[model samples]
Target: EASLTGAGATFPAPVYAKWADTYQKETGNKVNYQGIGSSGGVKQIIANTVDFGASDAPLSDEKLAQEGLFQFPTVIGGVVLAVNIPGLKSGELVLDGKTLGDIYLGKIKKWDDEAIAKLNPGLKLPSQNIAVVRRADGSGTSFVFTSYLAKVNEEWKNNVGTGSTVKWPIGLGGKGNDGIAAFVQRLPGAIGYVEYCYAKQNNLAYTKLISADGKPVSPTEENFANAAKGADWSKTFAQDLTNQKGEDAWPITSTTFILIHKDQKKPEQGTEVLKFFDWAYKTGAKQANDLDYASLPDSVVEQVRAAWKTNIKDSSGKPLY
Candidate 1:
């Protein structure tokens, strides 16, 4: 295993970059990862272009099986409703799933629309078009947000559930989380969904979420942990984890994946990949927290390591996949 290259999911790019930088220094093994968006990462791995590819959205088992590529989730995160309201602060807007779905579907245009006003009765709302900024490319961010919508709206469930790409009923398209965050910052009345880290770094105003259990929530690590509390990972090997049930589970919580090949093209490189992850799994928790991401619990890490022993193997049944 020589140096490695990875690309995808701007959602985890910040943390990935940090891991890569330190990994190189500690082990002298270089790792290059580009924040090219999740869809690109999926395609790249399917095409066998990189050492490993990443995605915030899990690929279906059928797709992974068809491509003969395996995936392992690395970290969990939150998606936030980042906005550009002049007087709004992060966690100030009370938004339910229905209202967000309506806005995305173009049924509600103005910030002062009655349905919205009902959520925040006394707050001043501009009688202006809610300029929605959506991902232009296939996106995991889109999947997380739309999955939440589907859970809240019958129409959305039947007509518009989650996927990497879907028909958008409204809004301008941005390339990735970066594009949506940047667009919202410059455009007044703009609203978009991006991972929490992006919102925090960009200093964007974020909405308070109405969770699945009818509680008002914000993107805190505790809420994210709660949301993921009871996830039955044994059954969901390769499906979306965003909507898993937990009291503190952020509605938009999703896991970033590491795509691996059933057969290693470069054994040395694959070995290096595992070693880097092993180091990060132990040493990267603080770094993850500093950037508002939750580290995988020790129990989960052990499970993954066990999986690696079974699945990530060299010839002779030795581990190194």
Candidate 2:
């Protein structure tokens, strides 16, 4: 059996694991993946260390052009502000962007801070000291979370900024989505951002956020997909979908992407990578939905296939697919 390997972006790791398992079973091919953070994945691909790389933060078009990398979205999900609070149920607490940004900024120090309490009135909020948890690695999840913060809070945009890696103003550090989930699960009064599936799997309580349309929305797959619908796929799949203006959208929604070299070092290996993703696009929707990830829309998938033909090519300049 032929073997293929990829690394990066723990955000979509669970669903990718599921897809890899079933694909291996049916095709008698081996697929190996490592859930390193997106930063590592991007670096690996740039250095030609891996077959492909996955990231929640799409590299800029300039960078893609410079590096001769082909990029496309593979799945969608929400980045939730998960909290550890006594007696609070998931989605029971609500926050807006400014307040959430302030919390991560170290300006809001307590669970019952005026801004938090103002949004979540009538509920008994603890006066517990707020402990922030954040990713310590170069991370695409951090990129998406910080991008939304930068959009909503001018202070955040100026002081903290956004990227796959940032100089966090405050917070303990976790290694990956799994690391942040573990930190929140164990630390009282702790809050961290993680993919929705990690929150669900770890039974962590996540807060609802007010969307750009001024409606509080939970991080369900349908709500995440609603956020994704705002993307103009005809223009660019890499466009940001955060803070979308839709009544039902989850404001922190984002698309995870896969990166591959335009020209492969080994044409046969590149062909195998394309074959695997084609199988996933056609057959992995149910598995993605089962893990709370929104499958790429069929229209978007068609565009992505076109991208493959136009971008990824063999040594002789023929498209792999």
Candidate 3:
């Protein structure tokens, strides 16, 4: 039996909590995970305080090699453009990438801007200054959502680029997904981006976005699954699911990952780490689906299992594989 702690991406925090609890109940080993956002997770793992770190933004292979760490994806989910429209319910306000990018750029200040009006056609929108809400902390949700905007909007790519943190042209910062959800819950005419679960749980009015295929789609599990269907785990296990070509694919789909040291502090620690994840891959997929996240395909699961055998080892320089 082993006890472990993890910290990272809030994008998958809810489902991760579910997995941890179930795994602990089924086995004696317990895991404690913190959703402190992605940037902090990376820091904690690099510092070697937590057993593992989680992030929606995957670290580079070069960085992993330099730090003596290895990582694998746990689940897939997508960012949604949630908004607080005074009159509209969820998915009533349609937006395309260009118009959504402009909202964050501070180019479109009013709810009734001509660009947005065009997207919604005849829908009557209140003329109010939009209160933009963004993550106050460094975030992988920010990375995934921003990268998506970068792909579809040229101006956004050049000006803001994409990272865990960026120069916000406009908006107030919320601390985490919970923070953003609460912030948007109260702030009327507010526009923010969050994981599909946050938007759903908070009952935030989210926008239907025009996908890369030029089709407008709601943020749904089916769409998120479609976005991940083509993921090539061979490519660093960080496949870019943004702006995919499928008509129903989510525009901001991203995979969350777990990172750990190449050499463990204990052989039992290494063994339990593998056990927790192996159980997750084999048994926790339904929990992921219930929480609006997608499970990795069987092929990706096999790929991760192989990586574990090859890359991870015990404290005594013994391969755990």
Candidate 4:
């Protein structure tokens, strides 16, 4: 008779929903999750309002040490460059890191700007104002996107920098990936960053981003998976897979994480949360693959389970499982 509640990153909401459907049916337990962005979930779990939470960016090591919490990644994905140009379908428009940085910086305002046109020689670009869209929430997606920008663009590095919340050089504020996608879909020349699944589900036109190895690649499972190979899985620290050097890598790949308290006020709730994730790790790969997310390797799953066993405890200071 146990139920679960959570809220977090729109990045993983699609796959999470799939897992929830099967999870509820199999166990006869209900699940309620909201795609409220990573920071929102962190706040919810920190306040003990939710049974579990999700975040795309891992908290700092020292911060986690002080907070009496633990985190582990549930899935890996790419933050894609989704656009609203009529002639540019997915992969038709190509963009490299510097050009993308400039567009969000308000340096490149027109869809037909020389910087973008130079990348796609034969493609026809529309003459219109480029509507820059970004997240209003303290989004982990923003942290990943801005981190990549800072990596490749000097101006962005010194000025706006990387953060879950940033002083945007330009753009309208969307709530999360959902709001970003909706705004981009409605606006004629909008450009925004969203998890690859949202781009596909929304049927939004996405760009082929040039990776660190200097090759333009689409945001496919293969590309995101290739980028993921470069991440370190041995620790709970945020794994930044952006600017990866694989020839077919997606430049904005990132992992989305789950967070729960170490001290369980309600051991039943904590027990169910771990069981749900444990099941997801063992049985949910196909569902995750269908949504274009890369699956976590068995090695990482082992580490997460070990952490759960050793760290998460009941109110009586006993291990939940």
Give the Å shift of residue 54 in candidate 3: 0.5
lDDT per residue for candidate 3 within 121-216, as digits (tens), equals 879989988999999899999999899889877999999999999999889999999999998889888888889899898778788888888989
Full-model lDDT for every candidate: 0.81, 0.91, 0.88, 0.89
Residue 173 lDDT, candidate 2, scale 0-100: 98
lDDT of 2 by residue, 1-321 (tens): 678889999999999999999998999988899999999999999999889998888888999999999888888988998899988998899999999999888999988888989898888998899999999999999999999999999999999898888889999999999999999999999999999999999999999999998988889999999987767889887878799987799999888889999987688899899888899999899999999998888998999888788888888888887
> For every model shown, what is its TM-score relative to the native structure?
0.94, 0.98, 0.97, 0.97
Model 3 pairs in collision: none
Model 1, 186-266: lDDT tens digits are 999999999998989988989987777767778986777677777767676454555555565577887788887767766
Q: Rank the candidates by lDDT, best first.
A: 2, 4, 3, 1
Off by over 4 Å in 1: 237-246, 315-317
lDDT accuracy of residue 81 in candidate 3? 78
> Which candidate model has the greater TM-score, 1 or 2?
2
What C-alpha root-mean-square deviation, in Å, does candidate 1 show against the real structure? 1.8
Flag the better candidate by lDDT, 1 or 4. Answer: 4
lDDT of 4 by residue, 1-321 (tens): 578999988899999999999998898877789989989999998888999889998887777778778888888899998899977767788999999999988999898899988999998888989999999999999999999999999999999999999999889999988899999999999988999999899999898988899988988988898998866777544778889987799999998888889999888899988899998999999999999999988888998888888999988889986
Task: Give the clash total for candidate 1.
Answer: 9
**Cα lDDT for residue 113, candidate 2:** 84
